[PDB]
Amino acid sequence: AMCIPLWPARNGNTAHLVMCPFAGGSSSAFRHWQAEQLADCALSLVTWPGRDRLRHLEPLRSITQLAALLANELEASVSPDTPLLLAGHSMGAQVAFETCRLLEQRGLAPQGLIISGCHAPHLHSERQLSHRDDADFIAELIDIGGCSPELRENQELMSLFLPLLRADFYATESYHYDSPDVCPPLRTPALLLCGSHDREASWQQVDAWRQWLSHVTGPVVIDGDHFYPIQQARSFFTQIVRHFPHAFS
């Protein structure tokens, strides 16, 4: 399964929040979330094929391919009686959006979509990595914030990580539409989140998601940098719960 549980539901809550991770983010990226359940919904993290317990698979190189895998899994595994919330940050926002698109088409719209820290699909990120050689690629990764310079000093780590990181960044950078009118807007209620000091996604880049979303609140600004879903988890989940009161009973 792509989805791995992080929180069980508690206090009788029936909602299930499914989180799509960062580009190159890993299992370990979200241990901080497992340390303390901040809301009563069940909470699962999506694993891209090619790493963690799915390392026996080749990494996919397309946002829409990831979304098709995830939409099928959720359609098979989530009871239609379960209020479903789809969330994603950075590249995960693109997968969450496209997954929501497929579920919505199928008559299985989730109760909510949370788009965090990501430019809209008709835009390109101002940071671009896929054209760079390995040294430059890693320097961008370090600049983003979730990568040790130790990676540069070990060809074996580089041979392990770079195909995964490069696959992720190719996927998220090649993901682009010429115009919002290429698809009908999504009707699933949506929340836009962005960070006050997030260098990967400005308020304007996230606000542009309103071209694709019929029922949207935000951007709601969380005080933090690109890692605010982790470093400011309390604000992150507070804003999610607040904006989806139906789904949290």
Residues with active-site annotation: 90, 226
> How deeply is 37 buried, as exposed, middle or buried, from its count of CB atoms within 10 A (0-12, 13-18, 19+)?
middle
CA–CA dist 158, 150 (Å, integer): 10
Pull the structure tokens for residue 89. 């940050």
Centre a 10 Å sphere on the Cβ of residue 229 and count the other Cβ atoms it contains.
31
CA–CA dist 136, 162 (Å, integer): 12
CA–CA dist 90, 20 (Å, integer): 9
| Bond into 219 cis (ω within 30) | yes
CA–CA dist 220, 206 (Å, integer): 10
CA–CA dist 70, 103 (Å, integer): 10
